[PDB]
């Protein structure tokens, strides 16, 4: 009503007063405080023309920069803090994979002296936290996780795994079904069959978890506020 | 510390400002001042230890450089760096690459003045997943990814430290040396074409950084913003 109009005007006035006080405070400060900006961060971007091609049913955490020509298929996930930077050469990851948070993928030597190096990740590959992948070809259903790093034209194959510190270097053809470790990499076991089923079940249930995180992380402000008030009132 | 007194009273005043603004908003009937959104200022100060990046030096908007950190031209701070300069400053020269997933850290306060600085002198590549805590790396340096440089280490003048390797306290890698493994032991010598390649990679990443920044300055794409406000 008219009362509403009046108090709206009054609220606008005192809000202006607040802005003025804030500027006065920054100017009493000054030179030091880097006042806040908007996000200005890209979850997806191109480089020269290559736009990313991302499946619809994927999860991409809004703290994961995909840049270049990244072709990411179905039922996969690019978790938090991730960096899929293929600005120089092609990146294609299989369908049903998962890059568990805070990992990186880069490629270097596009079409120099004839020899080229793409980078491909097979289906149902579960690369873990802090995994560095620098120009590699990981065939489908292979396990790499917890801080591993692959240096060069390495190719892992068909259920092989490198675990927890594997620094694999300079064009290693990983045998079809093993485990490696070591700094540098050597094998020490035989990768039992129930463990193969472990990596498969890992890919599957991790796709499930990624779908949950997507449904959560892709909400708007009003829906989030509703969810929060409902959670509080219910826990009451 | 009169500056710090001014800073504190500035906080009081600006805080009263925020509070009176919020009272105004509640009166106006608009609770938009709750849309939780990460601050993450890519460049941050503490009291007067603000960073200083030279113009034309690409810093990815997802980086995090805070504390007394100073960096010169032709440099690149690629997505996912933590450049801390709280206790002892970081200085980084020209034509340098600090790649994505790297921190140039400074040891949390040890008792004495044992908090060494960190100097990264121009024409240096510091690849992905690189932790440099309190070190002195010099011109024409290669720190190939998976790297750890613990406090007290000095690498210089066309020197390479391979990959996935850590260098303990008080170790020096002078010209023409590669060290690797846990701990970092000497392997072999270098090659002149490899040194020229160091320089060429430095230049190539300088150009890459120019491109990435010129793309990051592309007007924010209002269409997606109005989309996300629609639904």
């Amino acid at each position: 009503g008219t009362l509403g109009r009046a108090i709206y005007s009054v609220g606008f006035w005192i809000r202006e007063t607040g802005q003025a006080i804030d500027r006065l405070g920054s100017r009493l400060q000054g030179g030091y405080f880097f006042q806040e900006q908007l996000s200005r961060h890209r979850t997806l971007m191109n480089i020269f023309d290559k736009a990313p091609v991302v499946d619809k049913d994927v999860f991409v955490a809004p703290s994961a920069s995909v840049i270049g020509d990244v072709q990411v298929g179905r039922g996969s996930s690019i978790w938090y803090g991730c960096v899929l930077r293929g600005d120089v050469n092609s990146i294609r990851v299989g369908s049903g994979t998962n890059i568990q948070d805070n990992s990186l993928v880069h490629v270097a030597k596009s079409n120099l002296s004839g020899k080229v190096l793409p980078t491909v990740i097979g289906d149902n590959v579960t690369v873990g936290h802090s995994a560095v992948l620098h120009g590699c070809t990981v065939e489908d259903e292979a396990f790499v996780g917890m801080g591993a790093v692959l240096l060069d034209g390495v190719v892992v194959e068909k259920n092989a795994m490198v675990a927890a510190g594997a620094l694999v270097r300079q064009n290693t053809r990983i045998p079809s079904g093993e485990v490696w470790a070591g700094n540098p990499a050597k094998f020490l076991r035989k990768l039992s069959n129930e463990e193969i089923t472990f990596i498969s079940q890992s890919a599957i249930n991790y796709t499930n978890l990624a779908q949950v995180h997507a449904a959560e992380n892709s909400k708007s402000y009003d829906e989030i506020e509703f969810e929060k008030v409902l959670r509080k009132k219910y826990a009451r | 510390t009169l500056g710090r007194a001014f800073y504190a009273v500035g906080f009081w005043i600006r805080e009263t400002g925020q509070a009176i603004d919020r009272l105004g908003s509640r009166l106006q009937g608009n609770y938009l001042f709750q849309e939780q959104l990460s601050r993450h200022r890519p460049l941050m100060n503490l009291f007067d230890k603000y960073p200083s990046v030279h113009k034309d030096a690409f810093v990815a908007p997802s980086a995090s450089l805070l504390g007394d950190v100073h960096v010169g031209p032709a440099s690149s701070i690629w997505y996912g760096c933590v450049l801390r300069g709280d206790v002892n400053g970081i200085v980084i020269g020209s034509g340098t690459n600090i790649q994505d997933n790297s921190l140039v850290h400074v040891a949390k306060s040890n008792l004495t003045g044992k908090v060494l600085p960190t100097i990264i002198g121009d024409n240096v590549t510091v690849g992905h997943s690189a932790v440099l805590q309190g070190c002195t790396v010099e011109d024409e340096a290669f720190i190939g990814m998976g790297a750890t440089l613990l406090d007290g280490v000095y690498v210089e003048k066309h020197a390479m430290v391979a990959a996935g390797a850590l260098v303990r306290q008080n170790t020096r890698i002078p010209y023409g040396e590669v060290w690797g493994g846990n701990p970092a032991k000497f392997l072999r010598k270098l090659t002149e074409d490899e040194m020229a390649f160091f320089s060429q990679s430095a230049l190539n990443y300088s150009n890459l950084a120019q491109a990435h920044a010129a793309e990051n300055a592309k007007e924010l794409e209002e269409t997606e913003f109005v989309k996300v406000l629609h639904k």
Binding site: G1, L3, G4, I7, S9 | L27, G29
Partner: peptide, 30 residues
Amino acid sequence: ERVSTDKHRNYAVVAGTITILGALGWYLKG
């Protein structure tokens, strides 16, 4: 789009500003 559309809050705000004005007047009559 130039008004507040919550009746209860507006009544409460009227009461609050009346309260502060009354206290100021009371003090003025100390």
